[PDB]
Amino acid sequence: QVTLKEFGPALVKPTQPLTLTCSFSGFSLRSSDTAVVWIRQPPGKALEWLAAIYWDDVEHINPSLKSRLSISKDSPNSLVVLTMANMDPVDTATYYCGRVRFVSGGYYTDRIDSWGPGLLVTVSSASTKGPSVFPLAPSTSESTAALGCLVKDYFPEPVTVSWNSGSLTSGVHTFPAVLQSSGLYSLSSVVTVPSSSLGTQTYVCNVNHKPSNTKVDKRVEIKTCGG
Amino acid sequence: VLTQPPSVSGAPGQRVTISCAGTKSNIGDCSVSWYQQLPGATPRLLIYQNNNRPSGVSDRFSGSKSGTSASLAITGLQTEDEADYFCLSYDTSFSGWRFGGGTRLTVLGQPKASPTVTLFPPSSEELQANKATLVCLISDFYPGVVKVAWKADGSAVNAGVETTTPSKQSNNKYAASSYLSLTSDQWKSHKSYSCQVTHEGSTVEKTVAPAEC
Ligand SMILES: OC[C@H]1O[C@H](O[C@@H]2[C@@H](O[C@@H]3[C@H](O)[C@@H](O)O[C@H](CO)[C@H]3O)O[C@H](CO)[C@@H](O)[C@@H]2O)[C@@H](O)[C@@H](O)[C@@H]1O
Ligand SMILES: [Ca+2]
Ligand SMILES: [Ca+2]
Numbered sequence: 547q548v549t550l551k552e553f554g555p556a557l558v559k560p561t562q563p564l565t566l567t568c569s570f571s572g573f574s575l576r577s578s579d580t581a582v583v584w585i586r587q588p589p590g591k592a593l594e595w596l597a598a599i600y601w602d603d604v605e606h607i608n609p610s611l612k613s614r615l616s617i618s619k620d621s622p623n624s625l626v627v628l629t630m631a632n633m634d635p636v637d638t639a640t641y642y643c644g645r646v647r648f649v650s651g652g653y654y655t656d657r658i659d660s661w662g663p664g665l666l667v668t669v670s671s672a673s674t675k676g677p678s679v680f681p682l683a684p685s686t687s688e689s690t691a692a693l694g695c696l697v698k699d700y701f702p703e704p705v706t707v708s709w710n711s712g713s714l715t716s717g718v719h720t721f722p723a724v725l726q727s728s729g730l731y732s733l734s735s736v737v738t739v740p741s742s743s744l745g746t747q748t749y750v751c752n753v754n755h756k757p758s759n760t761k762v763d764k765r766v767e768i769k770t771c772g773g
Numbered sequence: 774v775l776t777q778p779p780s781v782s783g784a785p786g787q788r789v790t791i792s793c794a795g796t797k798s799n800i801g802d803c804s805v806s807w808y809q810q811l812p813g814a815t816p817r818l819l820i821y822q823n824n825n826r827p828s829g830v831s832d833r834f835s836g837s838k839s840g841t842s843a844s845l846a847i848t849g850l851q852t853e854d855e856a857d858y859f860c861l862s863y864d865t866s867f868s869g870w871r872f873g874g875g876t877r878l879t880v881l882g883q884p885k886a887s888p889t890v891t892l893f894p895p896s897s898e899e900l901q902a903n904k905a906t907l908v909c910l911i912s913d914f915y916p917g918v919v920k921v922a923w924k925a926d927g928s929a930v931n932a933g934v935e936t937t938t939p940s941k942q943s944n945n946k947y948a949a950s951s952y953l954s955l956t957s958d959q960w961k962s963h964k965s966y967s968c969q970v971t972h973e974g975s976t977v978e979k980t981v982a983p984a985e986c
Contacts, residue, residue: 606870694910724950
């Protein structure tokens with residue numbers, strides 16, 4: 547019955563301002579029991595209250611973030627805006643907007659009873675950059691061997707990796723990317739294959755990065771040592 | 774200032790409680806609400822004004838509050854209850870709303886599983902760019918918490934380490950990566966490098982050497 551949706555940039559650069567917009571449905575911000583709140587959550591961390599704006603334009607802003615935040619509303623168009631100044635890499639987070647309802651006249655009874663799906667905002671200085679692709683090879687006396695491809699220093703997400711143009715799916719594990727303090731991503735894809743056929747099979751990682759119009763193929767060769 | 778345990782466990786069918794420890798300034802005097810957030814999903818209101826359920830929330834969830842602590846209780850625990858649970862309360866000293874740190878609830882079932890650890894040395898290609906990334910890939914472990922330590926020759930390596938949070942695989946076990954970022958000169962100044970993974974008081978480690986053969 548009630549829905550909200552966050553609009554705004556997927557990325558923002560350090561020291562720049564972030565401006566998010568919440569559109570909502572199934573209730574009116576004119577109702578005297580109603581407010582709209584902005585909540586954020588860094589990846590893997592806790593929920594944090596940012597700012598709420600009430601039907602009568604009372605505001606409740608996180609005192610820790612007061613000097614950076616502003617919030618406003620356009621009730622006739624069901625829109626609520628949040629701005630946050632001087633962005634920092636620690637501000638990378640999923641930003642949710644929600645409906646708050648409370649008891650009129652009551653004492654901080656407020657609850658967030660409805661939630662938007664949330665917008666992941668990444669704070670990074672990076673421009674679009676295609677990955678450097680490096681082969682990962684091993685040690686080969688056990689039955690299988692793990693070969694892989696380091697997909698290094700790209701922006702933004704996502705990247706796709708296949709092996710042998712899709713002809714090889716078994717034993718493929720592509721690991722989630724890490725966002726480095728540089729503001730660039732890296733991930734690794736590995737394929738576990740029979741050791742016996744390392745000299746009989748060719749293994750090529752196919753790496754696609756659509757934002758940078760980048761397509762790289764890289765053959766992964768075993769490093770052999772003299773007997 | 775709102776304190777929740779980071780982690781709680783229970784068996785399917787059992788009752789578990791998640792507590793949020795506060796002070797007079799928050800839980801003591803103000804309404805507690807509770808939120809459930811499935812992995813990767815959106816938070817959802819479960820309890821408001823300490824002990825009320827919104828409609829469409831199961832009666833398996835209940836809330837209470839005594840003194841400066843509050844509790845969420847969950848009966849008939851089901852696998853789909855695996856989530857991060859948060860308490861929320863206004864705080865009149867803070868003059869602001871505070872969330873608990875979140876308690877991740879695990880539903881017991883799958884047996885313990887130790888990690889597979891794969892360690893790669895820098896490639897020749899990267900070394901020619903005066904760079905050297907050691908890649909430690911960690912997979913197939915359960916539960917999904919590991920600690921990663923790097924060693925160079927004998928000693929501990931702190932500088933240049935970056936490790937991902939554990940993620941779910943298609944086979945219902947967990948994966949993580951850790952990267953040790955060096956220069957080629959750094960790489961070549963030590964004779965061995967190790968990635969050591971600790972899982973449930975047990976250690977798995979891998980070793981690479983700049984002298985390949
Ligand atoms: O003040 C805490 C209260 O804030 C939110 O409700 C506000 C509140 O407005 C107060 C009140 O109207 C008046 O006494 O002083 C100011 C001007 O209105 C204002 O700060 O109370 C009214 C009525 O309850 C609400 O309409 C306002 O939106 C909610 O968060 C309450 O839960 C909270 O206790
Ligand atoms: Ca020999
Ligand atoms: Ca109670």
